[PDB]
Design a protein around this ligand. Structure first.
Ligand SMILES: [Mg+2]
Ligand SMILES: [Mg+2]
Ligand SMILES: [Mg+2]
Ligand SMILES: [Mg+2]
Ligand SMILES: [Mg+2]
Ligand SMILES: [Mg+2]
Ligand SMILES: [Mg+2]
Ligand SMILES: [Mg+2]
Lengths: 379, 379, 379, 379
């Protein structure tokens, strides 16, 4: 269960570099030099790293010197930068939003900040750029008219998309939904809301999703179903893997360590679909954990993914599972409901005896049990 | 606070006619004759009624005789039928889904059942047809590949949309999202997921949403924000009003009796946007309630809406509120971030002093308090 | 992974016998003869069966004949009856509550109904009697003063406890908490609330808990922590095992098929604590499932428990895990904070350098990863 | 709606003094001098203030000078200190717990820190001392054996209770339940769990609850029902008022601004029960809000409470409401189920015709609607 380059595992600098200052307590770890993160991640088998613009400054406040030290580390290790993003949430000026601040001068500041990091991302070869609208939203319904906020959100995203097209950066945008926290409610709270928003964009073709396991689970939604819809619409441009124990604060646990059963079926879907995107982890080591524990937790993300991958591969390869699937008539769902040359009257000429068929079973008990037994390594 | 025809209040037959058989107990009220519902609703000031195809049979099992008695009641009262829908969830053959049953013969049965009621809906003048995919989904991830289920869901909806176009019925379709119950997870679980799905339809122009207060709240989402996005995309084709106390079983309370503050801001948004759709109630009187209580609860829906409407009208008309809104700079959100003749270099030529502006306040405390005081009738 | 009598697995008649009529659809399975359930469960390795009084009537409406057929089946198989309970929730007269109905004649009916089944339970050798107050509660705050409802709840439970003492039945009572459903909120909504209530009872010594995995999880609570507190107070008199996917309707999935990670740690705690109670399953096979699927799902409960038991046994036996636990200083939590002969001034004479110790790590990353790897059968 | 001393309104220093640094951003307000808070709160009509030990140091790092400046402000204003508490959650040494840290030296540090502030609280006349175990818990099940953690929790609380008895401080302890945040799960997660824990204490008589509106609502529980049980057990020693929008991060909104309907019924219960405790607010002004907004938000807490108090007083005084309550037979719940001289055979001699009574209604529709109409100020 050792990670390989083909696994395309990657981490944000802000994950292993998180200082673990929470709502009720001080930081428990010192700032981590991104240069050390790049070397330690490379040594563990990570293929790539991602960053917010300001992550580069964790120990070096001079932006030019911080960028140079980052690139030197990437040169020495061969670590790739598949994606980058903007910090539009820490600085107090974004307290009311970034792209959707009431204050026009703040909105323009946000756009300019992204443009500078778009420039840097392209030079590093990042072909995907992530947008998490963490400050876009409100704590009360009177504070923000969401129709007008979406006007400004659409305006910012389409403006930036036209910018990258003018520069011929060849990049795609990935919107990261989140239902709440730090805002009482965040705009585009789920995979679905972001998909609906994307379809109104002038530049819709180059905008897709960066769904996060824990974010959809904060709303109690099924992450596997959401990823299925993202794949179905060809909008899975990025993914963020972690763990979460349902609707509460964003926990950012190690992938597989929240809803493990859902993680098993997520890996099953990613692998079986042949999705070729990076397996990116957006997690926090934990406030109990020291500097050495950090690398244990980074390894744990990749190892858990690899174990679940083997379990899911064995699950689908098992003749007992393929037999159970046929008993459930799962493959019959792929047959079109309507035939190619079939008219409305052709359809209404056929009848169905619903009373003869009312006692059909679908035998998911067997398939469900084989799935669980495979996950637990007992088959 | 007496309802008028312009209020466009309507009820489904299945709401006041619910027998109150739940997961753990028998029915507490006898079947209600739809003819009596039409007369009692008309007497209370309702403008319209809606129905599932099979609702018409509550006391009369002969479909032709049940339709005739329904139409006679509608004739005598002047009650309108703005919308109709299909029962694709009670009969055991739909236990695995209707449009997304594994069994092709069940999928075709579902389509034919809808087509018959589309025919009847058009004759009654319903110009909106509602689809709640209550059986579409699964209790376990192994049971249903959602990519393939969405293929079949899209296929059914587009097929039916082409049917109504061929018949020149002039109707629009309204998809009703729901996150769970009766299925462990339902396909298209939120307003967002349905919007994303609609955008892939061949007949996307004639398909929109029927969001339900309690359904989005079962996922902890902000119903006012979701309706705002539906309005923003011009997809609010129908609405279902009721109450809910967050993530639990679907409660179907009287509108305003769950999250009252959210109901206040929902009415504020519906009225201020000028949305002209019907105010439809999808609720249950309650298992403690007898046949007479039923009509008290129906009146309570309309009365609560009307009180909240007056409170929201007074809220926006208050000079103190308009002053607070200006202090918050709410109106400045409507100013485009980017000017019409502004280039990228024009934008990057301007700078922003983020440190000079870090202590700006937005003064939502005052606006929030005026909103609450208006809701509570104290202003 | 074959069940043995020492595993003490048991099922309620209402679990495998559930007809799968839900809030939105008809029953999909026919009534199941309890006689057949007793034989089929015995054949699968179940050790015991439990029942509501009225479960015995599923196919035989004559109570005396139904009891006789039940006892004959138990005689032939050697199946034990460790516990019994009362149906105080199906009949319409309980629509407002049973012990806490406003109507005094309903409260007295409830008490008499329990007394009759207490009599039958004793004859069958049940030494634990379960109380699920499923109708005790309200949908609105105005409907039920909970202080007065708890007066009546306490009165009923203490009255019944004195009855069983007068009869020398030697039984204990197990209160089953549930946060909601079918009521908007149920009285004694969690393990905690039931413990607090029990401590006010005259007969507190003979009253404890029947916690259910899915019930605490409907409130987002940690079932393992709750069982730990129940064990800590010596009040775990019964347990109900199933699965649930967080806050939504009560799902009654196969044990281990909801939050599998929590199920792993629950089995770890039950086994390591040496708790000797029965492992009772309160689940539903599923509405997609036919009569044959039912027994697959019953077997699946016991098999999943047994696999998790082996994984947890291997987890604790692993020297790597014991080493990780020592690194975390887990065993040091068992050392009393205060020594036996230590005064307040002795304690205040010692000082602690909090700044020297601020960077201590607890190394849960390693222990967490070993736990997950053991659950997944990879160690 | 102007606050008076009899309203007993109070605020923690940490509420209006919160700097609004959250999980994703910097502080937006400067540290607030507690001296200014005492004067500004007094001017607004607050009756009291409470504090964590370390709150006194917000602008003055010398503890003796900070205490002296605090007491001078209290002298000048006549503001009372009804309660105090300990910061056992900010400092990194508490990252694994305070009373339930694995490390014995940390547990003893926690106890000594509380003892010093118990000493100061007594001098200020605080007769209630609050314990929020915010760091007591875990993010994973392997990290903390809750049985052993509760041993140490009980040990600390009983030790401290014996200390205050030895000193003759005459104070009572108030345990503050919270389900999660900052820990994945917190020990004693609800009102119920704390009540059960209290009943095992040697010093149980002097230990009760400090329930917080938003904390129970984070678990989806009914705060009014929980307060009812606390009152019923005579354990409501303190209360914390704020607002929350269901299961998500702890929001700390202005009281009445989350679940307003529940706040209405909470005020109804507090006032009608005659509970004489302080009405304490534990809230945050909001990250959008500046130094002046802070006092608007403090006033808003008291004003919202007072408006709801008037609405609830008018509700109960309304003859229409008393008539509706009688129709519901609410008063009949107060009649004991069993008569004083009634034997088991006397009870079993009476019979109940359940079929004659199955169609009784309870008419909560009318009472519910009158309650909502009163809350909205329309009666
Ligand atoms: Mg996150
Ligand atoms: Mg992320
Ligand atoms: Mg509903
Ligand atoms: Mg509906
Ligand atoms: Mg259950
Ligand atoms: Mg149960
Ligand atoms: Mg709080
Ligand atoms: Mg508090």
């Amino acid at each position: 269960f050792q990670p390989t380059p083909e696994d395309r595992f990657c981490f944000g600098l802000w994950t292993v570099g998180w200082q673990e200052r929470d709502q009720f307590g001080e930081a428990t770890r010192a700032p981590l030099d991104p240069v050390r993160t790049v070397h330690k991640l490379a040594e563990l088998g990570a293929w790539g790293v991602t960053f917010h613009d300001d992550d580069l400054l964790a120990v070096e406040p001079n932006r030019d010197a911080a960028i140079a030290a980052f690139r030197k580390a990437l040169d020495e290790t061969g670590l790739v930068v598949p994606a980058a993003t903007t910090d539009l949430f820490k600085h107090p000026v974004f307290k009311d939003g970034a792209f959707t601040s009431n204050d026009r001068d703040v909105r323009r500041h946000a756009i300019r900040k992204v443009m500078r990091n778009l420039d840097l991302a392209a030079e590093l070869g990042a072909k995907t750029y992530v947008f998490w609208g963490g400050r876009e939203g409100a704590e009360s319904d009177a504070a923000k008219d969401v129709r007008v906020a979406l006007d400004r959100f659409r305006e910012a995203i389409d403006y930036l998309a036209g910018y990258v097209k003018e520069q011929n950066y060849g990049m795609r945008f990935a919107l990261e939904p989140k239902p709440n926290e730090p805002r009482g409610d965040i705009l585009l709270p789920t995979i679905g809301h972001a998909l609906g928003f994307i379809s109104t964009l002038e530049h819709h073709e180059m905008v897709g999703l960066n769904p996060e396991v824990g974010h959809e689970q904060m709303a109690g939604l099924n992450f596997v179903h959401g990823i299925a819809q993202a794949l179905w619409q060809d909008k899975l441009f990025h993914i963020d893997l972690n763990g979460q124990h349902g609707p509460r604060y964003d926990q950012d646990l190690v992938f597989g360590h929240g809803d493990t059963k859902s993680a098993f079926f997520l890996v099953d879907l990613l692998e079986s679909s042949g999705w070729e995107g990076p397996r990116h982890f957006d997690y926090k080591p934990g406030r109990t954990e020291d500097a050495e524990d950090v690398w244990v937790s980074a390894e744990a993300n990749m190892r858990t993914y690899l174990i679940l991958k083997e379990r899911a591969k064995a699950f689908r390869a098992d003749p007992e599972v393929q037999e159970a699937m046929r008993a459930c008539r799962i493959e019959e769902l792929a047959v079109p409901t309507i035939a190619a040359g079939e008219s409305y009257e052709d359809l209404r000429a056929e009848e169905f005896d619903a009373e003869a068929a009312r006692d059909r079973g679908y035998h998911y008990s067997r398939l469900n049990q084989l799935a669980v037994e495979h996950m637990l390594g007992s088959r």
